[PDB]
């Protein structure tokens, strides 16, 4: 079964925190036997920019990918000191030290072999996820090996 | 006194969605499919037959506004045109 | 509201397209019959909240179309078929000239689920059954006139949408 | 640019007969279904769309001559009107 | 012969029904592709005598409709899907604006069968297979354009006739 | 499976023998895996008379039914002396002797419970059948317990 869940359209940054809204489900309900549980969430790029860039490493262990967003000063995702933070300024072009919060490791998904998640490069074992918090969605780092809350993975659709 | 005829004839089914798809319904306003069907019947029945009304319903679902859905016509054995003619 | 068809088109159409359209009998003697079936409360499935609005709207539209609508609700597959057969053998169909079958419940590709459906206990009225009940073999009173079937149900688990690139 | 679309859309299948029936073929002039289909395409396509042409094919099979069969239009997901426009 | 639509009526129709009808591309730069299959020789079923007469007529009609018809015959079910998929991924489809799937063979309610059908060894291509191969997911090059499927086969071995009085 | 076979429409009597023709199958062939074998033939009354009458018996053992055809002088089917013959004698109103070639016993069929065959009353064991001879069809008496040729049974459709 081709399970698809949680297509975010677009939402900006607020108070040095990343929010993402989904489509309008104004109490719309299916005519199937319940289920409808959410596993992944991949869909974006409906024409608020979400920088993603690729990096080549002298120690090949997976594609290095950097995450950033645009602000008055461009902010970059970080996992320094095993905590989540958005660090401003821009990456110093091609990074030299392998252990850097900027770069991340992308791993393929068992679903349709078209999506990929992100893996922290400054630490081993961490994972990137987006959980259901209040009204909008919160991009909060969570451990994939542990089943916490609904454990929604933040995947992204690759270029064709 | 007796003559030949087909076992199945003059049938038409208007399914809510395409095969291997999901039907959707608004909890506070009813099903979107039926609601669209009723407004199309109330606006177009006077000048279009039943299959033309169904085509209007389908065309109204062409570009998916918000969530996607598309009804289909299945097992169409109709041989003539079926005008409802509301109010004689 | 529902826009009423003017009397001009009634006389203008049948004379010019007699062999291409179905015949319409006199208003007074005609006794049209339609069946509206919905499932709201179940035993293993989430309720279809808002179906009550749908029933009212469909009943009002069909009554506007001059149909003696019979409304049924929360019927098992056995009751599904029993009600369909009882509606098929009604003596008023001889004076009738069309019919409408409006169905709305949970369902799968095979058909429409009943009220005690379960994954381990299948219960569903197949499209073959409803089409066979109203054919020229089992319902001799519905020959040579349309049998319009309206279904509001699901057919697959897969959501009917995709994201492509222009 | 990425935007929504339906998995299944703009489809039409003209089955040879109704379900649980049999199609007939003449070993001299070919199958009756395609023989009538070519005639209707060659005579009506200039002023009738694909759906109109299929309806004419079905109407031509209304009264059973010799063996009885009736083609059906199954799984019709078409949203617009399809005009072949022969040579134009 | 086949009647030709006049040019000015062609220009008139699209302008007045742009959003009601499908788009038509320019004549010179347009590679429409159609597929015609008629397996006549089998291994366990009586030959479809006269199918070759239908092949020529269908091919001539489709060529009159400006379709680069590919004609196949005596294909297994595995070859049935292989040929269908190969026809789906043809690069000329991007310049096309419609397609035709003309199939003729023996078959059952499930679908059209190939050339090795046996009661102990079933072999049949389902309609779901065709609609899944040609849908907007597997064949992205056929978006927003009609996919006309024309088939001939049997469904249930029941004669579609009834002797009814009155 | 609701198996149906050859029907016949109408044909007359020629040379004191009954012929019956079927519909025109000008080499029409089905698109299903062979089979199409003939078991029963029932359809008539399409608008040369084939008179059928019912009789009540003082010794009830089934419905007594007579067959006759219209000619210059009306002929009646007979099984006298264990042979087939057409006697151009009208029945003498209500028959008195039970053992008479005019009356026949009608037995229901396993098919759809709408058709019935005919059974001879002048002899026990005989049966009425119509076999495929040459171009048209021959109404020839055959023994049902024995499988002879294709063993086509001659039924007749009852009034609604």
Residues 6+ apart with CB under 8 A from C50: B25, B26, B27, B28, B29, B30, B31
Please, is F122 exposed, middle or buried when counting C-beta atoms within 10 Å of its C-beta (0-12, 13-18, 19+)? middle
Collect all residues with Cβ–Cβ distance below 8 Å to F22 and sequence separation of at least 6.
F6, F7, F8, F9, F137
Residues 132-151 of chain C with CB under 8 A from chain B are: 134-137, 143-151
Q: Which residues of B touch D59 (CB under 8 A)?
A: 79-80
Q: Tell me if F20 is assigned to some domain.
A: yes
Domain of D35, CATH number, reads 3.30.70.1470
Q: Is residue D47 part of a domain?
A: yes
Q: Select from D6, D55, D72 the Cβ nearest to the Cβ of B68.
A: D6
**Does residue F83 form part of some domain?**
yes
Contacting C with CB below 8 Å, chain A residues are 1-2, 4, 7, 29-35, 43, 157, 160
- Nearest C-alpha neighbor of F93 from the set F78, F103, F83: F103
What's chain A's Rg over C-alpha atoms? Answer: 16
Range of the domain at F57: 13-157
Alpha carbon A102 to its chain's center:
13
**Inter-residue contact E163 to F155 (CB < 8 Å):** no
Of C119, C152, C165, the CB nearest to A33: C119
With respect to residue F122, please indicate whether it lies within any of the assigned structural domains: yes
Fill in the DSSP letter of residue C72.
Answer: E
- Dist. CA A96–CA C9, nearest whole Å: 81
DSSP notation for chain E: ------HHHHHHHHHHTTTTB-----SSS---EEEEEE----SSS---TTHHHHHHHHHHHHHHTT-EEEEE-S--HHHHHHHHHHHHT-GGGGG-S-EEEEEE--B-SSEEE-S---SSS--EEEHHHHHHHSSTTT-GGGTTS-EEEEEE--SSS--S-EEEE-
For chain C, report the end-to-end CA distance as a whole number of angstroms.
40
Q: How far apart are the first and last CA of chain F?
A: 23
Asked if the structure places residue B81 within a domain, the reply is: no
Residue F1 lies in a domain: no
The token pair at B18 is 């395409």
Beta-bridged to residue A117, according to DSSP, are: A107
List the domains of chain E with CATH numbers. 27-152 (3.40.50.1460)
The phi, psi pair for F116, rounded to 5°, reads -150, 140
Q: Is residue D67 part of a domain?
A: yes
Start-to-end CA span in chain A (Å): 22
CB contact under 8 Å between B10 and C145, yes or no, is yes
CA E26 vs CA A56, D87, F141, F150: distances in Å:
47, 11, 72, 63
Report d(CA A97, CA A115) in Å as an integer.
Answer: 28
Q: How far is B13 from chain F (nearest CA, A)?
A: 25
Would B43 be classed as within a structural domain? yes
Residue C150 has which token pair? Answer: 């309206």
Secondary structure (DSSP) of D31-46? EHHHHHHHHHHHHHTT
List beta partners, residue C104.
Answer: C38, C152
D65 domain-assigned: yes
Strands C111-113 and C147-152: unpaired
Distance CA D1, CA C163 (A): 10
Phi-psi region of D10 (alpha: psi -120 to 50; beta: other; left: phi over 0): left
| E119–F31 C-beta distance less than 8 A | no
Which residues 6+ apart lie within 8 Å of B36 measured at CB? B57, B60, B61
Specify the pairing of strand A52-55 against strand A64-69.
antiparallel
Domain that holds residue B51: 13-74
Interface contact A27-B27, CB threshold 8 A: yes
Interchain contact, F45 vs B2, CB within 8 Å: yes
Q: B8 and chain F: CB distance < 8 Å anywhere?
A: no
Where are the alpha helices (H) located in C22-161, listed in sequence order?
Answer: 51-64, 77-88, 127-133
The residues, any chain, with a CB within 8 Å of residue C38's CB and separated by 6 or more, are: C48, C51, C54, C55, C71, C72, C73, C103, C104, C105
DSSP H or E run through C159: none
C-alpha–C-alpha distance, residues D83 and C117, integer Å? 44
Is B10 in Cβ contact with C109 (below 8 Å)? no
- What is the CA A65 to chain-centroid distance, rounded? 11
d(CA D19, CA E107): 11
> C134-165 burial string, b = 16+ CB within 10 Å, else e?
bbbeebbebbebbbbbbbbbbbbbbbbbbbee
Give the span between the Cα atoms of E70 and E96, in whole angstroms. 15
Alpha carbon C75 to chain centroid, angstroms: 15
Give the number of residues written for chain A: 160
The one-character DSSP state at B60 is H
From C37's Cα to the closest Cα of chain A, the distance in A is: 15
Give φ, ψ of C148 to 5 degrees. -80, 125
Q: CA C18 to CA C32: how far, in whole Å?
A: 21
Q: Give the residue from B9, B22, B53 with the most D CB atoms within 10 Å of its CB, the best one to mutate.
A: B9
Pick the residue from chain E with its C-alpha nearest to F42: E163
Closest CA to B16 of E148, A17, C109: C109
D5 in contact with chain A, both atoms CB, cutoff 8 A: no
- Residue C78 burial (C-beta neighbours within 10 Å; 0-12, 13-18, 19+): exposed
- Left, alpha or beta for A113 (phi > 0: left; psi -120 to 50: alpha)? left
Determine, for residues A33 and C45 on separate chains, whether the beta-carbon distance falls below 8 Å. yes
- Alpha-carbon gap, residue C19 to C57, rounded angstroms: 33
Please indicate, yes or no, if residue F6 is contained in any of the structural domains: no
Distance from CA of B56 to the nearest CA of E (A): 9
Q: How far does Cα A103 stand from its chain's mean position?
A: 13
Best of D4, D7, D11, D43 to disrupt the E interface (most E CBs within 10 Å) is D11
Structure tokens at C161: 């949408």
- DSSP state string for chain A: ------------B-SS-BEE-----SSEEESSSS-----EE----------EEEE--SS-SS-EEEEEE-SSS-EEEE-GGGS-EEE-S---SS--SSS-SSEEEEEE-TTTTTEEEEEESSSSS---BEEE-SSSEEE----TTS--TT--EE-EEPP-
Mutate to test the interface with E, among D31, D35, D62, D74 (most CBs of E within 10 A): D31
SS3 content of chain D, % helix, strand, coil (to 5): 25, 20, 50
Distance CA C105, CA E38 (A): 41
Q: Answer yes or no: do F27 and D23 touch at CB < 8 A.
A: no
Q: Which of residues 93-132 of C touch D (CB under 8 A)?
A: 128, 131
Q: Which residues of F touch B3 (CB under 8 A)?
A: 46
Strands E68-72 and E33-38: parallel
Residue F4: inside a domain: no
> Which residue in A82, A116, A80, A85 sits closest to A97, CA to CA?
A80
Distances (CA, A) of A89 to A70, A72, A139: 10, 10, 20
The experimental method behind these coordinates is cryo-EM
Question: What whole-number distance in Å separates Cα of residue A43 and Cα of residue A54?
Answer: 20
Token digits for C120?
């381990």
Residue C132 distance to chain E (closest CA, Å) = 13
Q: Which of E137, E162, E164 has the CB atom closest to C162's CB atom?
A: E137
- Residue A156 forms contact with D (CB below 8 Å): no
* Domain presence at residue B18: yes
CB contact under 8 A, D6 and C162: yes
Contact C165 D1 (CB under 8 A): yes
Chain D environment of E36 (Cβ under 8 Å):
none
Closest Cα in chain E, distance from residue B62 (Å): 10
Question: Cβ of B22 and A24 within 8 Å?
Answer: no
Nearest CA among E59, E43, E145 for reference residue E104: E59
Query: Total domain count for chain F?
Result: 1
Q: For residue F95, give the CATH number of its domain.
A: 2.80.10.50
Total domain count, chain D? 1
The full DSSP string for chain F is: ------------EETTEEEE-----SSEEESSSS-----EE---------EEEEE--SS-SS-EEEEEE-SSS-EEEE-GGGS-EEE-----SS---SS-SSEEEEEE-SSTTTEEEEEESSSSS---BEEE-SSSEEE----TTS--TT--EE-EEPP-
Resolution at which this structure was determined, Å: 3.2
A86, β-bridge pairs: A77
Residues 6+ positions from C86 with CB-CB distance below 8 Å: none
- Do chains F and B touch by CB distance (3+ pairs < 8 Å)? yes
Buried b or exposed e, range E26-57, using 16+ CB within 10 angstroms: eeeeebbbbbbbbbbebeebeebebbebbbeb
Dist. CA D30–CA E28, nearest whole Å = 34
Residues of B within 8 A of D76 (CB-CB) are 72-74, 76
């Amino acid at each position: 079964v081709e399970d698809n869940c949680i297509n975010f359209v677009a939402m900006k940054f607020i108070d040095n925190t990343l929010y993402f809204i989904a489509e309008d489900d104004e109490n719309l309900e299916s005519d199937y036997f319940g289920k409808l549980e959410s596993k992944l969430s991949v869909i974006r790029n409906l024409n608020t920019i979400f920088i993603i860039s690729m990096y080549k490493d002298s120690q090949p262990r997976g594609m290095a990918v950097t995450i950033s967003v645009k602000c008055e000063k461009i902010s970059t995702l970080s996992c320094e000191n095993k905590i989540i933070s958005f660090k401003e300024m821009n990456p110093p072009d091609n990074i030299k030290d392998t252990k850097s919060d900027i770069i991340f490791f992308q791993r393929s998904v068992p679903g349709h072999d078209n999506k990929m998640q992100f893996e922290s490069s400054s630490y081993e074992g961490y994972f990137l996820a987006c959980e259901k918090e209040r009204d909008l969605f919160k991009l909060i780092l969570k451990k994939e090996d542990e089943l916490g809350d609904r454990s929604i993975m933040f995947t992204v659709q690759n270029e064709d | 006194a007796v003559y030949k005829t087909h076992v199945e004839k003059d049938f038409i089914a208007f399914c809510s969605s395409t095969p291997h798809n999901v039907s959707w319904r608004d909890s506070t306003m009813g099903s979107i499919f039926i609601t669209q069907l009723i407004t199309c019947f109330q606006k177009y029945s006077w000048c279009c037959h039943l299959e033309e009304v169904f085509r209007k319903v389908q065309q109204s679902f062409e570009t998916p506004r918000a969530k996607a859905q598309m009804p289909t016509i299945e097992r169409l054995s109709m041989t003539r045109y079926f005008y409802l003619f509301p109010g004689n | 509201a529902l826009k009423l068809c003017p009397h001009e088109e009634f006389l203008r159409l049948c004379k010019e397209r007699a062999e291409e359209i179905y015949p319409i009998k006199e208003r007074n003697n005609r006794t049209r019959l339609a069946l509206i079936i919905c499932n709201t409360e179940f035993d293993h499935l989430p309720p279809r909240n808002g179906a009550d609005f749908d029933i009212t709207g469909m009943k009002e539209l069909l009554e506007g179309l001059d149909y003696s609508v019979d409304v049924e609700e929360n019927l098992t597959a056995r009751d599904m078929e029993s009600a369909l057969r009882a509606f098929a053998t009604r003596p008023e169909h001889k004076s009738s000239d069309s019919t409408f079958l409006v169905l709305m419940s949970h369902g799968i590709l095979e058909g429409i689920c009943g009220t005690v459906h379960d994954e381990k206990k299948p219960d569903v009225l197949l499209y073959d059954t409803i089409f066979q009940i109203f054919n020229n073999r089992n319902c001799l009173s519905l020959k040579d006139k349309p049998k319009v079937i309206i279904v509001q149900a699901a057919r697959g688990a897969n959501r009917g949408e995709l994201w492509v690139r222009d």
